[PDB]
From Swiss-Prot:
Role summary: Seed storage protein.
Maturation and modification: Proteolytically cleaved.
Tissue: Expressed in seed (at protein level).
Organism superkingdom: Eukaryota
The protein's name: Vicilin Jug r 2.0101
Positions of region (IgE-binding): 50-57
Family: Belongs to the 7S seed storage protein family.
Amino acid sequence: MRGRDDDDEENPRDPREQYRQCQEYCRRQGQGQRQQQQCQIRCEERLEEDQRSQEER
């Protein structure tokens, strides 16, 4: 774009902290490699999904 948009800018909140939370939850509850992929994937979309929503308030 001619100017600078906010889509290419990182959100003020740290996504890593909540991402780490998913990893702890998944390991604590669940069994098998297949489930490990399932918990990480769901959290990944949600993580990106959360930033799109934006909550400045």
